[PDB]
Design a protein around this nucleic acid. Sequence first.
DNA 1: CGTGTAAGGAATTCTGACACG
DNA 2: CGTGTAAGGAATTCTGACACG
Lengths: 82, 82
Amino acid sequence: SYRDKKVMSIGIVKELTGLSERQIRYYEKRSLLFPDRTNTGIRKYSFSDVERLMDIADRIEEGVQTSEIRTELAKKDEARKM
Amino acid sequence: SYRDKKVMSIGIVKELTGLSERQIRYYEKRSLLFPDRTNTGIRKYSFSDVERLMDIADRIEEGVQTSEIRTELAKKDEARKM
DNA sequence: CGTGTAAGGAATTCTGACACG
DNA sequence: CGTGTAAGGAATTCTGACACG
């Protein structure tokens, strides 16, 4: 159950994903991932979010807009619940 | 492999374990766990360290000195490698 | 449209110490 | 011996903006 527990701040994610804080916080602004937040506002990510970020980055490179990606991901969640 | 990846700063550990930063940093000073460190000195813990902390706290409550605990844990590592 | 940067501040962690015991 | 606290500073994150495009 460790995979989905939100426990690592943005700095760690930046390293694990090789992405800038600008990119990471933006994808979230595009509703591509929903990190948790501490009462003091610091964003908390889980290992699952770390991978989600790598998928987003992959599609971004392949010249894909967040919207398209946002849809792709949406389709993947309904099936997971099945 | 998420279980052992060092990714969460002391604040998160404090919450997950209900232990004070004083206790956590001390157990490490007693060589009861070895957190990673970022180049900027911030300590990094893994889910495995989180559990290790709960075992330490458990024995501490049962009136056990870190030394004894340190030994108990030592014995558990050799067997794991087997 | 995705992303880089400088800006000012708010919250986090770190270390060594004094304390009691 | 394990742990609480105040102290001063160093590093982290957050947000909104200007930029190009």
